[PDB]
A and B are shown apart, each in its own frame.
With several copies, the nearest count.
Chain A
């Protein structure tokens, strides 16, 4: 099979599945509705590996008994009106320790996604994250569940 499976639901709506990294990201250019080019998709991939780096930084959860916390990309919104800008959507899954995890994840994402700085694709990136709480040992749980992408699909 292929490592990455992209698909166009709409000119401004792209679904990207990464089998090797076990990730799923939604590429959307909402502000303008412009068609996602090769550069836009490549930018999205660069953001996935960035957050992937943030995940392993907070702890290797690829091993058995992943205590967490889980940090995964949900969607990538591109502003294409005047200046090239990208808004990344991230979900943090995990009271004092929760605040510490949120702080570490926030700082890691700023460095990984190059927030407020010009990216390799000449892009100014920013991110928004939501906090979720679920049993890590639960059978009905996954970093990239269906309901998690309900906001962007």
Chain B
């Protein structure tokens, strides 16, 4: 049960958010090896951010999956997500952070996994 938070300084509409949504689904199924219906995605557009001494368009993606990650999976996920934000939001690669975390416990449908 992975969770993907997307923080962007640029405004996001229905088209952009839907695009990133399907992307994260494919990444979850193909790379993470998890069901694409079980991944939760949140989008935080128009977020006041500051990076590299400027308030220029910048993105920060948070990936959290229980049980950790595979050997070559984080490298793959980072590449795809960065490329996804680059094409969709127009944010350059050198202004995109992708952080990976692992929760101690995760709950769904009133029960833990």
Contact = CB atoms under 8 A, between A and B. Distances in A.
B84 interface: yes
B107 interface: no
Interface string A49-80: 11011101101101100000000000000000
Given A62-B87, A111-B36, A57 B19 contact: no
Interface string B17-58: 011001101110110000010000000000000000110000
Contacts of A49: 15, 18-19, 22
* 8 smallest beta-carbon distances between A and B, as pairs: A53-B22, A60-B87, A111-B26, A111-B29, A60-B83, A107-B30, A57-B26, A56-B87
Contacts of A108: 26, 30
B22 A50 contact: yes
Contacts of B18: 49
A41 interface: no
Contacts of A114: 53
B99 interface: no
Interface in A22-60: 49-50, 52-54, 56-57, 59-60
Given A52-B19, A107-B29, A111-B25, A57 B84 contact: yes
Contacts of A104: 30
Nearest to A21: B15
A55 to B, nearest CB: 9
Interface residues of A, number: 19
B88 interface: yes
B96 to A, nearest CB: 12
B86 A60 contact: yes
Interface of B: 15, 18-19, 22-23, 25-27, 29-30, 36, 53-54, 80, 83-84, 86-88
A110 B84 CA distance: 18
Determine which residue in A49, A53, A62, A108 has the highest number of CB atoms from chain B within 10 A of its CB, and name it.
A53
A111 B53 contact: no
A53 B86 contact: no
Given A49-B18, A56-B88, A112 B83 contact: no
15 contacts: A49-B15, A49-B22, A56-B23, A56-B88, A57-B26, A59-B83, A60-B84, A62-B87, A104-B30, A108-B26, A108-B30, A110-B29, A111-B26, A114-B53, A120-B54
Given A49-B22, A111-B36, A57 B53 contact: no
B75 to A, nearest CB: 15
